Amino acid sequence: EDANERIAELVKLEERQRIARDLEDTLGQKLSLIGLKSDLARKLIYKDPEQAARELKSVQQTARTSLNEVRKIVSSM
Amino acid sequence: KERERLEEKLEDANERIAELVKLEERQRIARDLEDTLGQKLSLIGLKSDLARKLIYKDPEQAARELKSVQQTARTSLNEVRKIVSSMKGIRLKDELINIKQILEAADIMFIYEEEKWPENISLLNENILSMCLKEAVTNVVKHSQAKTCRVDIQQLWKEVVITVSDDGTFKGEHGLLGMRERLEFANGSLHIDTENGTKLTMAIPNN
Ligand SMILES: Nc1ncnc2c1ncn2[C@@H]1O[C@H](COP(=O)(O)OP(=O)(O)O)[C@@H](O)[C@H]1O
Ligand SMILES: [Ca+2]
Incomplete structure (x- = not known):
């Protein structure tokens, strides 16, 4: 029954490789951005708070759609 | 010949077996991801929201939170390099x-x-x-x-x-x-x- 075993291992692997590329791209980028922007936002707490809040709503969105995306890369639908 | 129709019924079943095994793996991985990355992303959204909440109320608590958010983004970046290399x-x-x-x-x-x-x-x-x-x-x-x-x-x-x-x-x-x-x-x-x-x-x- 190996015959099926080892071939199916090959397909998992491939599947694994695919997800891996997708993730790598989108996510590296999005996490760096979130770091950056959360830092600008900190820079404004005092000097311009309304701005800092908008920036934070932004960071919130990029984290949300980041989840979505991961979810999508691994979507079975 | 008909060697064709046959090679292709073969192709069809291979493919189907294919999408089952594929999907089983994708799901297993989906659980792993929820469990690590999904949680970190969610957490980042949470803290950034908290921070926003504290802008006027407690500027210092908000700055503290944004530092926290920066750290969890850093470490998540790590998680990801590692994961992808491992995968x-x-x-x-x-x-x-x-x-x-x-x-x-x-x-x-x-x-x-x-x-x-x-x-x-x-x-x-x-x-x-x-x-x-x-x-x-x-x-x-x-x-x-x-x-x-x-x-x-x-x-x-x-x-x-x-x-x-x-x-x-x-x-x-x-x-x-x-x-x-x-x-x-x-x-x-x-x-x-x-x-x-x-x-x-x-x-x-x-x-
Ligand atoms: N480099 C080699 N030198 C001598 N014999 C070899 C070599 N590679 C393979 N063989 C022979 O081919 C046979 C089949 O090998 P393999 O398919 O790897 O199964 P196993 O290693 O379990 O025997 C081996 O038993 C071995 O005697
Ligand atoms: Ca051998």
Whole structure:
């Protein structure tokens, strides 16, 4: 029954490789951005708070759609 | 012929078996991801929201939170490099190292001219070559009692080829079926010339 075993291992692997590329791209980028922007936002707490809040709503969105995306890369639908 | 209709009913079922195994893996991985990354992303959204809440109320607590968010983004970045590397599986350059060890320590002289290292080899194909290679050298150390073993890794035009030759005693007639199968699966081939020691020619399309 190996015959099926080892071939199916090959397909998992491939599947694994695919997800891996997708993730790598989108996510590296999005996490760096979130770091950056959360830092600008900190820079404004005092000097311009309304701005800092908008920036934070932004960071919130990029984290949300980041989840979505991961979810999508691994979507079975 | 009808050789066609048949090869294609075969293709159809292979494909279906295919999407089941595929999907099973994707789900398993989806759980892993929820569990790590999904949680970190969610957390970042949470803290950034909290911070926003504290802008006027407690500016210091908000700054503290944003520092927290920055850290969890950093560490998540890490999680990701690691994950993806790990999911990429074992890499051919690395398998080369592995077998240098194995040979040297089973006391066999290892021969390797470094060359035009191929350029557009899918990660999957890289993995099959690494596998076929580990096994071929295993068989060297187990069956040949050769004194020397040379591996060549060359770009030929359709395909990458890796040969492994040993000046030892071809016995037998599991590993070899395994190699022919993986290789076969990627639209490549195994060849076995015993004309003077065990010589193995593992060719696979680049893709
Ligand atoms: N480098 C080698 N030198 C001598 N014999 C070999 C070599 N490689 C393979 N063989 C022979 O081919 C047979 C089949 O090998 P394989 O398919 O790897 O199964 P196993 O290693 O379990 O025998 C081996 O039993 C071995 O005797
Ligand atoms: Ca073997």
